[PDB]
Amino acid sequence: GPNENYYISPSLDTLSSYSLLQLRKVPHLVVGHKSYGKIEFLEPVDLAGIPLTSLGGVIITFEPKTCIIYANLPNRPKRGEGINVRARITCFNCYPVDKSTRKPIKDPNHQLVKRHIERLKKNPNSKFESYDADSGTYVFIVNHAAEQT
User: Fold this and answer.
1) Signal sequence span per UniProt?
2) CB-CB neighbours of 139 under 10 Å
């Protein structure tokens, strides 16, 4: 996908061309900007017209290091249907160099990569998926759709 821009399941406009059920029943959700990072959602989107614009405008934002939802939207479904965040997020440039020595690290050296992974395990707020040393890419799943209250 050497696409300069980002593609969707199968695009903002392409999605609109969806049938009545298809629009409200989004099978596979795929959103990625290649360079920014590949993000895939296993959740659905039932709106029967995509009225996201009313809620915001961009409908979807992705920082080239961090993922951005609608706006800290804890899946607040006051009225209508909402999409869960039960998906995997992938971010590039995991290696944020070493500030201690300012050692520009851009290789699979993994000098302190192990330390970062250990911290993730302690964090019981997100589910660790799989970490690739060769690509240094970090993928994890944080589904907060379900609330205990």
Assistant:
1) none
2) 19
Q: Report DSSP state, residue 18.
A: S
Please, are residues 89 and 139 in contact by the beta-carbon 8 Å criterion? yes
DSSP 39: E
Q: Domains of the chain, with CATH numbers?
A: 1-149 (3.30.1610.10)
Q: Amino acid identity of 141?
A: I
In the numeric block, which tokens belong to residue 88?
A: 């995997």
Please give the helix or strand (H or E) that residue 90 lies within, else none.
Answer: strand 87-91
Question: How far are the Cα atoms of 94, 99, 100, 109, 132 from residue 104, in angstroms, in the given order?
Answer: 13, 9, 11, 12, 20
Kind and range of the H or E element at 24?
A: helix 20-24
Here the tokens at position 139 are 């993928």
Amino acid at 120: L
The structure tokens listed for 70 are: 């609608």
Quickly count: other Cβ atoms within 10 Å of residue 43's Cβ. Answer: 14
H or E element, residue 16: helix 12-16
CB burial class (10 A; 0-12, 13-18, 19+) of residue 38? buried
